[PDB]
Amino acid sequence: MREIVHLQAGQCGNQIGAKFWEVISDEHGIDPTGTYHGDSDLQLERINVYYNEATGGKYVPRAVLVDLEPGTMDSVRSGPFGQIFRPDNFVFGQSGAGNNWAKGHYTEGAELVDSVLDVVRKEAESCDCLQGFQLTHSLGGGTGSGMGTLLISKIREEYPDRIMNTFSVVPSPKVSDTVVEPYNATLSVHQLVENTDETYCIDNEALYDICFRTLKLTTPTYGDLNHLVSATMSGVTTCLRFPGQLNADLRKLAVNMVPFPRLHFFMPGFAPLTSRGSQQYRALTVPELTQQMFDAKNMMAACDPRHGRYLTVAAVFRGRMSMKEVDEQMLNVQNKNSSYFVEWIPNNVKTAVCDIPPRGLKMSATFIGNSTAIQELFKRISEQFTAMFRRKAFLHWYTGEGMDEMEFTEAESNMNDLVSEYQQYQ
Amino acid sequence: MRECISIHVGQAGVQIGNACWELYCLEHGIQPDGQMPSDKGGDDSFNTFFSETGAGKHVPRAVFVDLEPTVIDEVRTGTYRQLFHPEQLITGKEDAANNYARGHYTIGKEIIDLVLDRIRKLADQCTGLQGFLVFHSFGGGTGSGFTSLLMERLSVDYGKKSKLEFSIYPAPQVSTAVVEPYNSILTTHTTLEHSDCAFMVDNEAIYDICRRNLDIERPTYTNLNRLIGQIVSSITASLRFDGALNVDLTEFQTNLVPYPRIHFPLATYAPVISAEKAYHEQLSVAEITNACFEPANQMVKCDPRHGKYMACCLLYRGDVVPKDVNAAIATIKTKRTIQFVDWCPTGFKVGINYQPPTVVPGGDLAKVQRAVCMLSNTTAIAEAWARLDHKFDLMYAKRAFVHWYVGEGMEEGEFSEAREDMAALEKDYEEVGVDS
Ligand SMILES: Nc1nc2c(ncn2[C@@H]2O[C@H](COP(=O)(O)OP(=O)(O)OP(=O)(O)O)[C@@H](O)[C@H]2O)c(=O)[nH]1
Ligand SMILES: Nc1nc2c(ncn2[C@@H]2O[C@H](COP(=O)(O)OP(=O)(O)O)[C@@H](O)[C@H]2O)c(=O)[nH]1
Ligand SMILES: [Mg+2]
């Protein structure tokens, strides 16, 4: 009745997406075989949201996996859950994008679009009432950034009224992964502002901070970082797939979060997170859960709330708790910290309480923040783009793909308007 | 003969429904299967709320309506799944999403003909329908918008019948949505023009009573909804049981609404107490009436000392005798804290009913010999609206969310129109309080 179609683009898209499907299969109790072994009859009531049914009690993800070069997807298929995906939903080229957004958007990826759009039509038209679409990708890359935005721009013409969510990793403030990173990131944000309803700005350098400072891990792998992102991703949908005292789907959140149509970039967070040693020193309560949820250290984005004002907030609590205590706590935070909230919205926080916590955990929350501090992200990208573009440092790789230099000045102007659009509410 | 139809809209309406119909089954001795074992006939008392199938199965005269299948599906699956008729539990596919325009203009029109068709069948089963009891929230898209549409339609098909309207009004401070002001203000027209009598409660008041009167530190919706059920049971008690002075819904309305535009009573119920405290108190007729006039026991966050009483209806249950009701009322009339308008010199309607309150097992309330429910029409309610106009004007001065509403086929002239309707109503309430 409210089905999601899941899209994975590029190296980072596939590595995150593979972890997501492991996480929610554990909640629903699906074995690596694809067969149900859960103990609770409540676990199959809404499984249609993410899985199709198959004969013999086998469930398959409603996912399509895309890469311009197969190399990463072979590693995915060699993993434990890598067998659950339908083989027809791997769509792959034979030449990499080279981290070049033009190659991914105009030359290599444009030849691959038609194969993906056939899979998307076949999955989407099977749904009784499609909720919308969900993309995982990175902005710094070539397939994620280039073709991921190409796909978004196409399916939003085929389905204008459906929800379009992007979980997008954005380039981090002080150590780059890719030299041409700011061109790709700037050209890509120009595509997001026109064509998305929600964007969640994950930043790898904030995830290292959580793994070190909060979880005290000495040897975190990307398997740990991708776990954090998947917990956020599953928290936002939980009210579509479990009963609760105050339900809240993707559309209900977006309506309460986005005051003006451009201001749709959000900072995620998850709680509780504790190290092995501290577990014994906690006092598991909603207050203690709320305290960590608003802590600036806990944000998955490299932007600090203290430098801006919250426009709107959502908290999706999971676990059987008292509605009064939640309503109390969300008022109390707003009354003390009056400077951090915009004046002309009287109540900024949306709440939604579900009954079913993740396995082995008593209570949980997922945080969504829409904040003027997000201008900090775009403005540091804008300066690096300008520093390179005035010297034309790498343009011949993009203009040799037939791109027009006017499109670079356009992306500056649109991204510079967006930082101005946020500044007026500081 | 004397039937009532209940209409439960949205998550708040459906979840209040669960508490109400649990109570009514227990109050009449109907099992969750719908069987009465005590039919070893001659009992009519159930016939206001239930109808009898020839198999001896008793079926609620209810309709449950929501644009999302999550809240209703629990009802279809829990303990009472055998009680309700399968077709009375109407559900859609996608919620109005806190947007009034979705509930009113786009999603609501898909399901409304089913709901209106089912209400025909229930009204045809009746032979002396008293009226419709509507339960909804102001803040939701389905509660605000779909109910707006529904009552406009019911007004045409049943223009004579009383529509009573219990509703969750937004609290002064605590809240769950940001768009809560827009929906609330836009709701006002239908409560003003299509409701014969509207009772408003807000959750922040009821959280207060459950803390100082029931000693519950962490109440959920299940505790609040049980208090609302007790009010509705008391209003309909004189339809169901014998009494010295029974009050009908028609007679109840005549004695509270002095003008067609002025129909917003405050509800209050007493005693609300834990059984641990009921041990240390005598719940005499005088004592329980004084508790109805305390501002701390009102179900809206408004203080009646800042306004004037126009009329009061007092409904008493159980071990109560007229000698002591007369003594209690006479005392209240002496207290200068309580001021009636000069043009209403006989401000009380009294009802006395012999059947005492029932109690749900594992509930919070005590088992008590007697209780009183008070319905009071007061100028003090106007402060609750002014406090919410402010939130609307604050947001709307810069269009803060309007594209969500205009994109769903509203037009923006409704925002100022509804705000002006609320302004006119507030101006009426302040002037009717002026002494002649
Ligand atoms: N007292 C009480 N209030 C409730 C209950 N459930 C929800 N509410 C209130 O209802 C409001 C939220 O809107 P809902 O009633 O859930 O909305 P809806 O009518 O289902 O419509 P949509 O929002 O479109 O799904 C808030 O004011 C909640 O506090 C309940 O069981 N009891
Ligand atoms: N959080 C996270 N980031 C990743 C992962 N894999 C790659 N990245 C980051 O995403 C960017 C690389 O994306 P890229 O490989 O270029 O995507 P492509 O467009 O398909 O080539 C770099 O910033 C990497 O640090 C992962 O598993 N998790
Ligand atoms: Mg709802």
Numbering used by the authors:
A (entry chain B): 1 to 426
B (entry chain A): 1 to 40, 44 to 439
The publication says:
In order to understand why, we undertook a structural approach, reprocessing cryo-electron microscopy (cryo-EM) data of the human microtubule doublet isolated from the axonemes of airway multiciliated cells to determine a structure of the tubulin heterodimer to 2.8-Å resolution. Within this reconstruction, we could assign both α- and β-tubulin isotypes, based on their sidechain density. After evaluating each residue of the candidate β-tubulin isotypes, we determined TUBB4B to be the best fit to the density map and thus likely the predominant isotype incorporated into airway cilia axonemes in vivo. Thus, structural analysis further confirmed that TUBB4B is a cilia-specific tubulin, despite the expression of many other β-tubulin isotypes within this cell type. The site of mutation in the TUBB4B variants associated with the three different phenotypic classes of disease (SND-only, PCD-only or PCD+SND) were differentially distributed across the structure of the protein, both within and between tubulin heterodimers. The PCD-only group (p.P259L/S, p.F242_R251dup) variants localized to the intradimer interface, the interface between each α- and β-subunit of a tubulin heterodimer and have not been reported to be associated with human disease. The previously reported SND-only TUBB4B variants p.R391H and p.R391C localized to the interface between adjacent tubulin heterodimers. The PCD+SND syndromic variant (p.P358S) was located within the intralumenal face of the tubulin heterodimer- the side facing into the microtubule lumen- close to binding site of the anti-tumor drug taxol. Our combined analysis showed that different TUBB4B mutations disrupt distinct molecular surfaces of β-tubulin, which in turn disturb different aspects of tubulin function and result in different ciliopathic disease phenotypes.
